Amino acid sequence: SMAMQKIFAREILDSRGNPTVEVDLHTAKGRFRAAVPSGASTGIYEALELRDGDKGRYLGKGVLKAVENINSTLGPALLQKKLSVADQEKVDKFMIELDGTENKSKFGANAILGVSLAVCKAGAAEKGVPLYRHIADLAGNPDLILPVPAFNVINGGSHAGNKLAMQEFMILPVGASSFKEAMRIGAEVYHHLKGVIKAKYGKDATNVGDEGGFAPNILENNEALELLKTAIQAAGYPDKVVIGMDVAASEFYRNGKYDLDFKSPDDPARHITGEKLGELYKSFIKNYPVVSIEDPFDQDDWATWTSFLSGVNIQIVGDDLTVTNPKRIAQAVEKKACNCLLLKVNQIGSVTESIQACKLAQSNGWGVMVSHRSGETEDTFIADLVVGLCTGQIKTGAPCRSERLAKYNQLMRIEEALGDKAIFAGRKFRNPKAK
Amino acid sequence: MAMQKIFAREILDSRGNPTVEVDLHTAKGRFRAAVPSGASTGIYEALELRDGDKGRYLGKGVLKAVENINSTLGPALLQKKLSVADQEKVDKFMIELDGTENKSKFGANAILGVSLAVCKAGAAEKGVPLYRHIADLAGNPDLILPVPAFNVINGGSHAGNKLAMQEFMILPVGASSFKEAMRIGAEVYHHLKGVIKAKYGKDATNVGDEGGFAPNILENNEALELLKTAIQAAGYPDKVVIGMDVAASEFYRNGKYDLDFKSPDDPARHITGEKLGELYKSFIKNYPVVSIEDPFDQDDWATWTSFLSGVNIQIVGDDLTVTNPKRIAQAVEKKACNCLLLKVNQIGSVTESIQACKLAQSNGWGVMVSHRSGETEDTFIADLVVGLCTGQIKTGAPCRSERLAKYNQLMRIEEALGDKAIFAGRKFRNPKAK
Ligand SMILES: [Mg+2]
Ligand SMILES: [Mg+2]
């Protein structure tokens, strides 16, 4: 196929003011553009992001090298192979084999993904179907599902300057009648939350973090949960909103125990065992509508994850545990460590591998939650992705900052286009096919 | 040339509030535009139509504006069979159909959404880029990349610090290109974050609506010194200058000005307009301050006139002028200011925005194209500032993608123009001068 006419890459700025890769692919159908969300340039289990490391330029975060790899090498090689733009698997296989390394470190995981994404968009256009339909086709899925959105509205953990140890406190409008109404509920709860924060914590307490949520200066994770409850009740949706958490416990594990005040000066006297931590989670589940907990234990604390899951009935999500990595996921499945995969496309580095990972988790009875990264762009690919993959759940920010709202707005447009055939996952978010 | 379909919807803006988006289809494809937040009440600007259902999005829905497009305005425009390239006749048609002075029959947000989508379609019909079509509509032969003005330290009425003045901006006028202006701006921003974190704490770096920081400070001199520190740490003291938006109407009190207006009332601390002017002269003498927006109250005309005559910097109307032709004519006649802030949604059509810019430039004024606090993923104003050749745009800190979307589009425009691209640089006030 001579469908692919031109491939050009550039450096643009992400939502945090750091460089990332953008790729334009041209065919007879037009120009197809995709950008890559920030990832990791080091790490043992994820695909390697290539960063320039020039400390005098963008504080070492340039992506000139990755961009050059596309313009000079990867792009020309792909165009010369004359592959169909609709054959996502063959295209991704070619790029993976040309790179030839397990972690995409020859060209950069960011270089390969940028191309992979643009090809996918062009493939949908060649077939004359929406991107969300092409993705479903690629996943062998006859149907399409609008996800429940999970909004990270109260923020703690390593990147927030409060004492609050747990990372993400999310609201999920599972009781909404449609995706459009899930956005209304989400936004109204957020607006009421801001007013509660201004009153209780001060006129200086309402600026936002990287994902659009708030970081009031609190320590108690129960106090964060009570704020969500207060905002839900203030908006008048107690019957329709549930809560999801991301603990990110690897961030506070030390010498075999867990520190829920780890942003205060070192003091092992305050550390708690994994067993006491599990008891705290059970109290959350009893006292609040907590339906999902991500990274409850450290990434290597396998026996503790396995024990915990056997005694609860909620969703337990792997992020640092699994890292969108086949070998790690296989360990988790075999050890029954968790029951939901967080899906970050840039951690694995191709559209095909991301789809494969989703389908394998689903075949083992797990849920899948599609995820943003903290460095996002105006790109909306992951909205079409979650719909075509039929997962029933996405986290892509508070309803604030347009690198977040761009995805939520796109999900609204997708539901609009589907008309009276649209299905919203609602209370079946964990598995939209459940009876 | 023919318009085939027009369809409007409600989307969420960058602060989580509804706004209007319009799709216009022609033989060339789909052309999509969204409207930034504005004002539903006011004497001098076009009226944004909000639903006012207090139970739905806290009264901020735009169902009525959207339905005005789908049910009335859209079908009326289509029936008229106008060329999508004739921006002037299209906008005239919609303005006369509405028939009010402030666009309050259909809503300024309804009219503007259609106006923007028509302009994008018309560029394609003519075989030229959007920025070139705008330059054609404005009568400009050349294209100019603007200096970006990044709002990196925030105060005034919508931050909870004591800092009375509203916006502290950095402008990389000494950059070699737009691409390098972005690199300088971003590096300064990252160094500023570190400076603020070390001085004011780990909890001091969350961001406002436009992506900037609100450290808990009182002194406007301390805001300026923070910029100086960040600029020096980044290594660009010879290439970055400073702009300010005072928004002085926010702290005008019974004929005087209160630079600690968020602290408990005490009229003994209030200062005269003359004293406030002397403070600005100190900023200009001791820091590289080159531009001040709304230095005085929106009705304090004599004080603006007197101040401008004794300073050689840029003085920008925002609340003074409100992108309103009658207000702008008064400011021209009185020599109140010498630069227009251009908010397309305050006037409500592309044609009137272009006319306002041209009238300002014909009077020797500069023009700075501006975002709104509630923005979207739309990048129209990037193409707009390049076609209008104004040399200057303020559209956010280099943080939050409703801001970066515009900055990234300006880098793409520069890339498309190649080695012929002209960057305003040190001629930002008037790119045609010298
Ligand atoms: Mg996580
Ligand atoms: Mg202003």
Side-chain angles (χ1 to χ4, degrees), chain A, chain B residues 2-53 55-431 433:
Chain A
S1 175
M2 304 181 291
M4 302 186 203
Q5 296 176 353
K6 175 180 157 171
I7 289 168
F8 182 78
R10 73 178 59 78
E11 183 187 55
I12 62 157
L13 294 192
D14 85 6
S15 60
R16 300 201 284 188
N18 297 313
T20 193
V21 178
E22 184 173 86
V23 181
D24 292 354
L25 170 72
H26 296 250
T27 67
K29 291 267 165 209
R31 183 184 67 201
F32 300 92
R33 177 172 285 165
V36 177
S38 175
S41 61
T42 68
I44 290 293
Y45 313 118
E46 67 211 280
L48 188 93
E49 177 182 83
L50 181 55
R51 293 279 173 183
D52 296 343
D54 180 350
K55 279 176 153 170
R57 184 167 183 285
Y58 282 106
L59 292 148
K61 298 178 178 192
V63 292
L64 302 171
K65 296 178 187 182
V67 167
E68 185 61 4
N69 289 339
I70 301 168
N71 288 328
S72 274
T73 310
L74 177 56
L78 180 57
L79 293 176
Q80 195 166 25
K81 204 69 182 162
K82 291 163 68 159
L83 302 172
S84 174
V85 76
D87 198 343
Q88 191 70 40
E89 296 179 12
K90 194 167 285 200
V91 173
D92 285 332
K93 177 168 161 168
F94 170 78
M95 296 190 299
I96 284 159
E97 287 183 0
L98 186 64
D99 174 282
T101 73
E102 210 151 7
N103 64 345
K104 301 183 175 61
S105 66
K106 182 168 163 164
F107 300 135
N110 47 342
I112 290 167
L113 182 64
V115 178
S116 191
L117 292 171
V119 168
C120 194
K121 292 181 197 197
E126 179 170 276
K127 284 166 64 176
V129 298
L131 176 61
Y132 52 84
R133 180 56 71 188
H134 181 47
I135 290 169
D137 290 346
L138 293 169
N141 283 344
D143 308 328
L144 307 167
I145 299 288
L146 276 297
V148 174
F151 303 106
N152 180 21
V153 305
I154 297 288
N155 309 155
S158 305
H159 303 298
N162 52 17
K163 287 166 178 196
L164 185 67
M166 299 178 182
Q167 190 171 280
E168 306 172 9
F169 293 80
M170 293 173 267
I171 57 167
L172 286 68
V174 296
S177 69
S178 62
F179 193 82
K180 172 183 193 175
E181 292 300 304
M183 293 306 310
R184 173 183 171 192
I185 293 169
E188 289 177 2
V189 175
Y190 184 85
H191 297 317
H192 283 278
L193 178 63
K194 190 180 187 195
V196 171
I197 291 170
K198 182 180 161 192
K200 190 179 174 185
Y201 302 107
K203 294 178 195 153
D204 63 337
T206 69
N207 272 6
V208 300
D210 284 340
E211 300 174 26
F214 306 110
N217 284 330
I218 63 170
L219 167 63
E220 301 287 334
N221 298 285
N222 283 322
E223 180 168 352
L225 286 167
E226 189 73 11
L227 283 168
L228 290 192
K229 181 175 176 169
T230 299
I232 292 164
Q233 288 174 346
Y237 305 110
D239 55 333
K240 295 179 190 185
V241 181
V242 298
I243 298 171
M245 298 174 70
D246 184 4
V247 174
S250 302
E251 298 294 309
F252 57 75
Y253 194 55
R254 178 167 304 181
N255 285 300
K257 295 174 88 176
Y258 290 92
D259 187 356
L260 298 183
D261 196 358
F262 78 102
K263 295 177 279 173
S264 296
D266 173 70
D267 185 4
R270 76 197 172 216
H271 301 174
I272 65 182
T273 61
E275 303 78 345
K276 291 284 168 212
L277 187 51
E279 293 177 4
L280 183 59
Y281 299 142
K282 289 175 177 173
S283 80
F284 293 160
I285 294 167
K286 198 178 90 122
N287 291 322
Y288 297 100
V290 171
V291 296
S292 181
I293 302 179
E294 180 181 321
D295 281 341
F297 306 100
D298 180 76
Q299 56 177 264
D300 298 326
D301 192 5
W302 289 100
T304 306
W305 285 75
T306 296
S307 285
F308 186 75
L309 181 61
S310 72
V312 304
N313 52 27
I314 69 155
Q315 174 163 276
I316 298 295
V317 185
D319 175 15
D320 290 333
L321 187 72
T322 39
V323 68
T324 320
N325 180 274
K327 289 187 210 257
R328 292 290 292 189
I329 292 163
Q331 191 158 166
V333 171
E334 202 267 324
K335 291 175 188 277
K336 303 187 187 160
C338 63
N339 64 23
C340 184
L341 176 64
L342 199 75
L343 197 79
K344 286 167 174 173
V345 297
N346 88 292
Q347 288 189 312
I348 195 158
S350 75
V351 172
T352 295
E353 293 170 291
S354 296
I355 295 172
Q356 289 173 331
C358 183
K359 293 293 284 190
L360 202 67
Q362 293 172 326
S363 76
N364 283 293
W366 285 24
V368 176
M369 185 181 278
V370 170
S371 184
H372 64 170
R373 306 301 310 266
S374 33
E376 272 293 339
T377 70
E378 53 266 49
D379 187 279
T380 63
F381 185 96
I382 63 168
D384 294 68
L385 183 73
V386 70
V387 168
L389 290 179
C390 295
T391 87
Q393 44 180 340
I394 184 166
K395 69 178 206 183
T396 188
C400 176
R401 300 169 68 121
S402 300
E403 72 282 1
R404 319 298 154 183
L405 278 325
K407 283 68 161 172
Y408 295 128
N409 283 335
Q410 179 64 353
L411 286 165
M412 287 200 291
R413 296 192 205 89
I414 292 170
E415 172 173 77
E416 177 197 290
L418 295 176
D420 66 6
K421 300 299 186 275
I423 300 293
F424 172 67
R427 290 171 192 281
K428 292 182 177 180
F429 74 102
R430 291 178 56 178
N431 173 18
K433 307 185 53 163
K435 300 129 175 284
Chain B
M3 312 183 188
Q4 298 172 345
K5 180 184 174 176
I6 296 167
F7 180 84
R9 68 178 62 77
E10 185 181 50
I11 61 159
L12 297 187
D13 84 5
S14 70
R15 309 198 276 188
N17 295 315
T19 194
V20 177
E21 179 180 84
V22 177
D23 292 351
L24 174 155
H25 298 255
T26 73
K28 306 272 186 201
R30 186 183 65 201
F31 298 92
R32 178 173 284 163
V35 176
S37 182
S40 60
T41 75
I43 285 278
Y44 305 126
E45 68 211 276
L47 188 127
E48 164 184 284
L49 180 58
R50 295 278 169 183
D51 294 346
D53 178 350
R56 183 170 185 280
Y57 281 111
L58 296 147
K60 298 184 183 171
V62 300
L63 301 174
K64 292 181 191 180
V66 169
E67 176 62 3
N68 286 344
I69 295 168
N70 286 324
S71 277
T72 303
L73 181 57
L77 175 55
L78 294 170
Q79 189 172 42
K80 201 65 173 160
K81 289 116 204 172
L82 298 175
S83 166
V84 80
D86 204 333
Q87 188 70 39
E88 219 196 319
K89 288 210 315 92
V90 170
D91 283 333
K92 183 179 163 206
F93 170 76
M94 297 198 282
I95 287 162
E96 296 181 348
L97 191 61
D98 173 281
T100 72
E101 330 211 75
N102 63 347
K103 296 179 176 64
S104 63
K105 184 174 181 164
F106 299 132
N109 45 345
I111 294 175
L112 181 63
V114 180
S115 189
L116 297 169
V118 163
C119 190
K120 291 182 181 186
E125 190 240 271
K126 286 170 62 179
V128 303
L130 177 63
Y131 49 86
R132 177 46 80 179
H133 180 48
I134 292 167
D136 292 344
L137 296 169
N140 292 325
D142 306 311
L143 298 172
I144 305 281
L145 278 290
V147 178
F150 302 107
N151 181 20
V152 300
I153 300 179
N154 310 154
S157 64
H158 302 101
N161 50 15
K162 291 168 168 144
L163 191 64
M165 305 183 180
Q166 188 174 283
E167 311 173 5
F168 293 80
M169 295 171 267
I170 54 168
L171 288 73
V173 297
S176 62
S177 62
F178 194 86
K179 180 181 177 169
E180 290 306 306
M182 288 315 305
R183 183 207 168 166
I184 291 170
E187 290 173 359
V188 176
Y189 178 87
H190 297 314
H191 278 275
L192 177 60
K193 190 181 187 186
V195 169
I196 285 174
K197 185 173 175 177
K199 186 164 180 173
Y200 306 104
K202 293 194 181 175
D203 65 343
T205 61
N206 268 9
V207 303
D209 284 342
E210 305 178 9
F213 306 116
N216 280 337
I217 60 170
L218 170 64
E219 297 294 334
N220 298 291
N221 277 325
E222 179 172 355
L224 293 170
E225 193 72 14
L226 290 164
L227 297 181
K228 182 173 183 185
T229 301
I231 291 161
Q232 180 60 53
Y236 303 117
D238 54 327
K239 298 184 183 177
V240 175
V241 297
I242 298 166
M244 298 172 65
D245 178 10
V246 174
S249 304
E250 299 295 314
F251 57 81
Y252 195 49
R253 305 289 180 261
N254 293 316
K256 300 174 79 160
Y257 291 94
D258 186 1
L259 296 181
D260 196 2
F261 78 95
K262 293 172 283 173
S263 296
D265 291 355
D266 185 356
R269 78 188 171 223
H270 298 182
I271 69 179
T272 62
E274 296 56 51
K275 200 157 148 184
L276 180 52
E278 289 158 37
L279 184 65
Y280 299 142
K281 288 166 185 179
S282 77
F283 291 165
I284 294 156
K285 187 173 82 163
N286 297 109
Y287 295 95
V289 175
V290 299
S291 182
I292 304 174
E293 174 183 329
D294 284 341
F296 305 106
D297 184 66
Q298 63 180 262
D299 305 306
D300 192 4
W301 293 96
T303 307
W304 283 81
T305 297
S306 289
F307 183 75
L308 177 60
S309 67
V311 304
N312 70 18
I313 67 151
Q314 170 165 277
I315 301 298
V316 187
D318 175 17
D319 290 327
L320 185 73
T321 41
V322 168
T323 325
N324 178 273
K326 279 183 204 206
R327 296 281 296 184
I328 295 165
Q330 176 163 184
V332 168
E333 182 181 75
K334 293 184 163 189
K335 293 207 158 175
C337 63
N338 65 16
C339 184
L340 175 59
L341 198 73
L342 193 79
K343 289 168 172 173
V344 296
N345 87 305
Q346 279 190 321
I347 192 161
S349 70
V350 168
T351 297
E352 295 172 287
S353 296
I354 294 174
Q355 293 173 329
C357 181
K358 294 300 280 203
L359 195 56
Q361 296 173 141
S362 78
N363 282 296
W365 287 25
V367 179
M368 178 183 287
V369 172
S370 179
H371 62 170
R372 303 307 301 268
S373 23
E375 268 298 330
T376 71
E377 48 275 44
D378 187 274
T379 62
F380 185 90
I381 67 173
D383 292 74
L384 182 68
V385 69
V386 173
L388 288 181
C389 295
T390 86
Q392 43 174 342
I393 184 171
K394 77 178 204 181
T395 189
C399 175
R400 303 170 65 124
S401 299
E402 75 279 3
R403 315 303 153 181
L404 280 323
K406 285 68 159 168
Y407 296 129
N408 290 333
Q409 173 73 353
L410 290 166
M411 291 196 290
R412 297 195 201 91
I413 295 169
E414 177 169 71
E415 172 197 297
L417 293 168
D419 75 352
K420 305 264 200 294
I422 300 154
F423 179 58
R426 293 178 187 283
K427 303 192 164 189
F428 76 101
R429 289 176 56 185
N430 171 19

